[PDB]
Amino acid sequence: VDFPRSRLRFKEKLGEGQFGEVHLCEVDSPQDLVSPLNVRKGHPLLVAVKILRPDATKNARNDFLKEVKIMSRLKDPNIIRLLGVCVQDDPLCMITDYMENGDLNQFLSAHQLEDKAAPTISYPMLLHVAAQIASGMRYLATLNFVHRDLATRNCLVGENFTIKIADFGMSRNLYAGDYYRVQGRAVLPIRWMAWECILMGKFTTASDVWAFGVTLWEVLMLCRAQPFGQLTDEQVIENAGEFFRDQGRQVYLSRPPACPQGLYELMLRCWSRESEQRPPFSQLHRFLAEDALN
Ligand SMILES: O=C(c1ccc2[nH]ncc2c1)N1CCC2(CC1)C(=O)N(Cc1nc(C3CC3)no1)CN2c1ccccc1
């Protein structure tokens, strides 16, 4: 059942993509449509809508139709959700919740750790942000779904520090420095990648755990610094080789200022050479949710 396209009212542009756009839209007369949405009375219902340009290539339309298939199965509080589609006619549309605070890298960058002595954020809230990401990945693991590009730039933030995992792709200018590009090869977020992904292209739930470790390091750094930021792309790839050789010469991300040694030891577990020794997301969530409880 197509969402009624006529009820979508443009407001502003959230994203310029290569073959489409993401727009912020209001939903005209929202009460008629509620079954999958929830709207407070007398307030504007805002949604994000990904629209395929109606003259986009056949390749682009194919990729869009597959993304609809993938999005359709995602049903978890910490993964973005498909509210509806308009695909029986053109332009093809997907609809999702509006997350008013944008991506998590930009959001956290504007905050400082609160000073007990005295926009800020507390240590327990940082853990709450991290645990929501772990819960989202826990869900994806039960689907045997491998993300392949977990990073704070790919998470969205709503009200009250709620987090949802997304996947923007790798084309945004703002994050060009986070990807390694070689002609004729896949574009690769090497600073977030397990050693076996870099050397063999093997992406698994276990390499998603490695990437979660880096993502947790980002959060505890308040997104103030790039992983391995003082090293070149070449040195990061060479480091992957040192994990393989296993002669004690591989290096790790350092402990953030806001990060206690216990939590750092969890990050190091996420970066275990052997993929089967890395913790499952069910245990990562538990650790982080306990600590954030008090
Ligand atoms: O530009 C934005 C954006 C910016 C600011 C915003 N604030 N509030 C909302 C919002 C949206 N994007 C984020 C959402 C987006 C398009 C890019 C996306 O990363 N998609 C692919 C995807 N795959 C997965 C699976 C791994 C879980 N999750 O997402 C699909 N997806 C999307 C967007 C709109 C409707 C339907 C899908």
From Swiss-Prot:
Residue positions where Phosphoserine is found in the record: S29
Binding residues annotated for ATP, in chain numbering: L14, G15, E16, G17, Q18, F19, G20, E21, V22, K50
The Protein kinase domain, residue ranges: 8-288
Gene Ontology cellular component list: extracellular exosome; extracellular space; plasma membrane; receptor complex
Highest taxon of source: Eukaryota
Active site: D149 (proton acceptor)
GO BP: axon development; branching involved in mammary gland duct morphogenesis; cell adhesion; cell population proliferation; cell surface receptor protein tyrosine kinase signaling pathway; collagen-activated tyrosine kinase receptor signaling pathway; ear development; embryo implantation
MF term (GO), any: metal ion binding
Keywords assigned by UniProt, alphabetized: ATP-binding, Calcium, Cell membrane, Disulfide bond, Glycoprotein, Kinase, Lactation, Membrane, Metal-binding, Nucleotide-binding, Phosphoprotein, Pregnancy, Receptor, Secreted, Signal, Transferase, Transmembrane, Transmembrane helix, Tyrosine-protein kinase
Residue ranges that the UniProt entry lists as topological domain Cytoplasmic: 1-294
Post-translational modification comment from the UniProt entry: Autophosphorylated in response to fibrillar collagen binding.
Tissue note: Expressed at low levels in most adult tissues and is highest in the brain, lung, placenta and kidney. Lower levels of expression are detected in melanocytes, heart, liver, skeletal muscle and pancreas. Abundant in breast carcinoma cell lines. In the colonic mucosa, expressed in epithelia but not in the connective tissue of the lamina propria.
Function: Tyrosine kinase that functions as a cell surface receptor for fibrillar collagen and regulates cell attachment to the extracellular matrix, remodeling of the extracellular matrix, cell migration, differentiation, survival and cell proliferation. Collagen binding triggers a signaling pathway that involves SRC and leads to the activation of MAP kinases. Regulates remodeling of the extracellular matrix by up-regulation of the matrix metalloproteinases MMP2, MMP7 and MMP9, and thereby facilitates cell migration and wound healing.
Domain statement: The Gly/Pro-rich domains may be required for an unusual geometry of interaction with ligand or substrates.
Name of the protein in its database record: Epithelial discoidin domain-containing receptor 1
UniProt organism field: Homo sapiens
From-to range in the entire protein, with total length: 603 to 911 of 913
